[PDB]
Amino acid sequence: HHWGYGKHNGPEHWHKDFPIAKGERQSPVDIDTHTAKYDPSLKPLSVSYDQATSLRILNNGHSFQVTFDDSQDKAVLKGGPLDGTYRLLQFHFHWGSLDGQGSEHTVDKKKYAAELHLVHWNTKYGDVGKAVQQPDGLAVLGIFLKVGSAKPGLQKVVDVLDSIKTEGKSADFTNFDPRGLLPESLDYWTYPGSLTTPPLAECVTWIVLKEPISVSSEQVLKFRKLNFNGEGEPEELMVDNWRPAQPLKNRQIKASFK
Ligand SMILES: O=C1NS(=O)(=O)c2cc(-n3cc(CO[C@@H]4O[C@@H](CO)[C@@H](O)[C@H](O)[C@H]4O)nn3)ccc21
Ligand SMILES: [Zn+2]
């Protein structure tokens, strides 16, 4: 019935309800680093998160997300390949059952343990619902997670997950600073793509950072304790909620760095 990541409702099934699944600019993709072209005309990314207002954290049955106040230019992404101003709406993660899988984008076929998506929408379209219907409506900042040392800025997130174990649970999650999730370098790859979950709309300028962040085994283990199911249903652990790499087709990935 509903789409998911299982054998009978996973990514290979999605095209039946969402035919754009087989479209011309689908995400994620493998980033072949030796084929990506350095584009000296790409500006540095501008990440302005100082006034970010987080609101809530929610288990939505496919991942968990932290949502922000996007009614004002408080946490915005600009520059890079983007024209105009993109407001941060939410961030969420994709992760695996094991450390060797979980990311959606891959780098020379390498899978990371997880991938962070910070979802922004173009203010010129007024609301995110309008923006998803535009070819340049969204900008998603993708950040790889590898397992090693802990990420201190992630800990406030993992500590509240026990309160949103099952689908539909939400909790107050104020005063969270997403700057604590960023790597040192803002070097990136960029390409035109799509949402990686239904409706798979082709509305995203992808900005994928070259430098992963490191998270600890205990931190990622807490991700894996979440549930796909709702309270009172048979427990199915929320793991491997990633879409695999899709055909690049007629696209060139650009790099901001040599
Ligand atoms: O996991 C996938 N990886 S992804 O490609 O980065 C992505 C983007 C989205 N987006 C959903 C939306 C529309 O937002 C809706 O309405 C607003 C109302 O405040 C949101 O609170 C709420 O996130 C969602 O219900 N824009 N992007 C959903 C899932 C993934
Ligand atoms: Zn995502």
Side-chain angles (χ1 to χ4, degrees):
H1 160 193
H2 209 263
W3 70 268
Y5 296 93
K7 178 173 170 190
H8 298 279
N9 69 353
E12 306 308 316
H13 290 276
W14 292 354
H15 73 98
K16 288 177 271 171
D17 276 320
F18 307 91
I20 197 65
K22 295 175 176 292
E24 299 303 304
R25 50 175 286 186
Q26 287 290 287
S27 295
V29 297
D30 178 54
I31 299 166
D32 191 82
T33 63
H34 290 293
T35 300
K37 193 176 179 178
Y38 170 70
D39 186 347
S41 72
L42 285 166
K43 306 183 67 178
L45 262 186
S46 171
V47 185
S48 303
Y49 285 173
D50 41 285
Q51 289 300 310
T53 295
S54 62
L55 297 173
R56 294 195 63 82
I57 187 165
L58 160 73
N59 178 336
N60 56 38
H62 313 282
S63 65
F64 71 90
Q65 64 183 91
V66 172
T67 64
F68 290 79
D69 170 22
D70 64 341
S71 71
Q72 233 182 332
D73 285 8
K74 285 176 167 185
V76 298
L77 187 63
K78 303 190 299 92
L82 308 170
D83 295 328
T85 301
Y86 290 69
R87 289 185 191 161
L88 178 63
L89 171 61
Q90 52 117 310
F91 69 76
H92 61 271
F93 298 80
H94 306 264
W95 61 91
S97 51
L98 305 157
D99 292 355
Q101 65 193 40
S103 69
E104 298 203 307
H105 293 88
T106 55
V107 182
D108 297 326
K109 296 303 175 77
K110 172 180 169 61
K111 297 172 170 75
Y112 285 91
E115 189 174 326
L116 164 63
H117 292 160
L118 294 120
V119 184
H120 312 73
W121 56 271
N122 194 327
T123 62
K124 83 188 190 181
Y125 298 126
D127 68 77
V128 65
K130 296 296 174 328
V132 293
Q133 313 177 30
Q134 316 300 328
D136 62 344
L138 265 56
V140 184
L141 181 55
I143 302 174
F144 295 119
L145 279 63
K146 65 183 184 173
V147 178
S149 60
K151 190 68 167 171
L154 179 61
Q155 190 60 31
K156 283 162 68 171
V157 173
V158 301
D159 274 341
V160 82
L161 294 181
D162 73 287
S163 76
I164 55 156
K165 184 180 188 180
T166 49
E167 174 172 13
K169 296 190 102 64
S170 65
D172 295 299
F173 200 67
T174 52
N175 304 102
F176 180 78
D177 196 330
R179 288 175 299 186
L181 299 174
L182 308 179
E184 286 174 3
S185 182
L186 292 186
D187 288 345
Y188 62 89
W189 298 282
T190 185
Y191 76 95
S194 74
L195 308 176
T196 66
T197 53
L200 305 169
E202 293 182 330
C203 60
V204 181
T205 300
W206 275 97
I207 301 167
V208 177
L209 297 186
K210 168 201 65 179
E211 178 184 338
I213 59 166
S214 288
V215 299
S216 66
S217 47
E218 293 90 357
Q219 286 179 322
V220 69
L221 281 172
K222 283 184 161 76
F223 286 8
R224 299 181 181 142
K225 285 188 160 154
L226 292 165
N227 285 4
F228 281 129
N229 56 279
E231 194 176 9
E233 299 167 24
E235 179 172 26
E236 303 290 337
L237 292 184
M238 186 180 281
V239 294
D240 291 318
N241 54 349
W242 49 278
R243 190 194 196 191
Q246 302 300 303
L248 189 58
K249 300 189 165 163
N250 185 243
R251 290 177 289 180
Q252 251 303 136
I253 300 176
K254 303 296 190 172
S256 74
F257 62 96
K258 279 194 169 183

